[PDB]
Every structure is written in structure tokens, then in C-alpha cells.
Amino acid sequence: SKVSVAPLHLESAKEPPLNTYKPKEPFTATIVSVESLVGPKAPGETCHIVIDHGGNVPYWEGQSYGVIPPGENPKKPGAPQNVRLYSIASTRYGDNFDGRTGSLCVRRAVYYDPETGKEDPSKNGVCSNFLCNSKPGDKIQLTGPSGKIMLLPEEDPNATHIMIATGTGVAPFRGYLRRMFMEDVPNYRFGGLAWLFLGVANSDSLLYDEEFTSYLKQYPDNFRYDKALSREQKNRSGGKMYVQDKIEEYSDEIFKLLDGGAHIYFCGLKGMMPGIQDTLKKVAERRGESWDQKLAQLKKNKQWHVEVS
């Protein structure tokens, strides 16, 4: 059955925490664990980082933590590094179900010369490698939490939530789905439909697949899960299989759900949004509908939730 979580007082706040810690005085959190999420054929390393905040930096699902990596700002001598934001991949209780930890899902940014393929560690991403190189006991300067765009609308516990992720964009949805399905949260009993679409390069690049597959077996009437493996599958037009192509496969169901009030969420690569928009326009056209008019209504009705970069 559902996993006991504590403390229940994390359900009491009526508003999300915001900017509890600020860059000039971050919270010094401690790494609990860092593990790779991916297999040897993944094009890059993505890691799962568990951070002990001690209950000092609570958050709601869908929010981000800021991390200030060590060092000086290259563009401002004497200044600390800029905050990098990471979407929290855990529920407010965290992976130890105790309200003391939060988790990040971090892609290592690695630079390769476009011509030679030669790696250049000096051009790698500072914070992502800092995080995935961390070890238990290391300290992390945390700020935030921040963000409200991806907060989960809970007013209707039987709402439909269609979640579209590319890569580490799956982060908030891991938290949504644990709250919907895994954790014993007496004041939020989800009875709607949650539908996760996840795009990753190949099978070795899947993130949390065992967890999501378990929900299909535990909640077959409330959870659907579709994957687009870009380098293992091709779309109807001959391009790599992206999430927009999986959305197209279920266009009639998705449009009906949206017309019925479903929320739809997009997280991950900013580059996926033009492709999604093009696909949805084409689907609407085939149905004799205007996508522009539909999207305007979804935005007016607060059904459309995008956080990409």
C-alpha cells in the first residue's frame, strides 16, 4: 500500500515556500548520495542527487532549488558563482519519507569540440559536474526554493494531468507521481488520470523507468506511461522519435482530455516546444480545429504549464 510519510505538518502551509534562503546567505546542505541513473549506452551521464536540508528548506512539488557551486564568478572577480536552478525530483517528504531531504536529477553538461569530438573539461558545465561529482558528506550551498509555474493543482483530486518531459525535465513529474501514487498523503487522494510522456535518447537513458513502470501495475486505471526513444525509434515522417510524435499517436485522446479540463505540463529542453506546437497545430488542422484558439483557451483556463530551458 502507500508509504507512510512524515511530518504531516508539511501539508499545513497554504502557500508554497519561496526564497527562504537567498544567494548572499545560502543554506549549507549536505549530500546524502549521488548515483548515476543511466546505463553505458546513454550519450551523457545523468545523476540522482539526494541532499539533506534537515527540514530547513522545505518545498512543494514542482519547485526548484538553487545551487551556488563553489568558486568565483568568471565574469566578476571576487564574486561568488551565479545560482543554477534544479527542478526538485522528490516530493516534499523526500526520498527518505521524512521531510529532511530533497533530490535533484542532473544532466552533466560536457563540452566536445564540434569538429574533432575532443573533450575540453574547462568548458564543461560548472554546477552540473560539481553536483554529479559530489560524494556523501559534501556540502552544497542551497537557495530558494523558487518557482510556482509547475506547482501541482490539487483543488480537484480527480483532475487529469498530462506530463510531457524530455530528459531531466522528468524531475517535477517524479515528485508529482510519488505524491499521487506512492506516498500516504491523507489530504490528497488522487483519483484522476496521470499520463507521463518521456523522451530520452535510448533505453539506457531512461530515468526512473522502474518506478514509473511500477505505477502501471499498481494504478492501471489512473496512470499511463509512454516513452519516445529518439535514437532507437523514428516518427511517422522519418525523423527521430520525439515526444511530440508520441503525443500525435494519442492525439484524439489528448484533445478530448484537454477539452474536459486536463492540465498539461511541459518540462525539459526548450527546443521541444516548437516541435510540440507544430504537431498540435497539425493535429488540430486534421480535426478541423484552430490550435491557436485552443491554446488561448487552455492558457485562459490555467491548463497549460511550461518550464523549459
Ligand SMILES: Cc1cc2c(cc1C)N(C[C@H](O)[C@H](O)[C@H](O)COP(=O)(O)OP(=O)(O)OC[C@H]1O[C@@H](n3cnc4c(N)ncnc43)[C@H](O)[C@@H]1O)c1[nH]c(=O)[nH]c(=O)c1N2
Ligand atoms: C527553472 C530551471 C530548472 C532547471 C534548469 C534550468 C532552469 C532555468 N536546469 C539547467 C541548470 O540550471 C543548468 O543551467 C545546467 O545544469 C548547466 O549548468 P552548469 O553550471 O553545469 O553549466 P555552466 O553554466 O557552467 O555552462 C553552461 C553551458 O555552457 C557550456 N560552456 C561553458 N563554457 C563554454 C565555452 N567556453 N564554450 C562552449 N560552451 C561552454 C557548458 O558546457 C554548459 O553546457 C536543469 N538541469 C538539469 O540537468 N536538471 C534540472 O532539474 C534542471 N532544472
Ligand SMILES: NC(=O)c1ccc[n+]([C@@H]2O[C@H](COP(=O)([O-])OP(=O)(O)OC[C@H]3O[C@@H](n4cnc5c(N)ncnc54)[C@H](OP(=O)(O)O)[C@@H]3O)[C@@H](O)[C@H]2O)c1
Ligand atoms: N524547469 C526547467 O527549465 C528544466 C528542468 C529540467 C531540465 N531542464 C533542462 O532540460 C534539458 C533536458 O535535456 P537532457 O540533457 O536531460 O536530455 P537530452 O538527452 O539532451 O534530450 C532528451 C531527449 O529529448 C530529445 N530532443 C532533442 N531535441 C528535441 C526536440 N526539438 N524536440 C523533442 N525532443 C528533443 C533528445 O533526442 P536527441 O538528443 O536524440 O536529439 C533526447 O531524446 C537539460 O538541458 C536541462 O538543463 C530544464
Ligand SMILES: [Mg+2]
Ligand atoms: Mg536504465
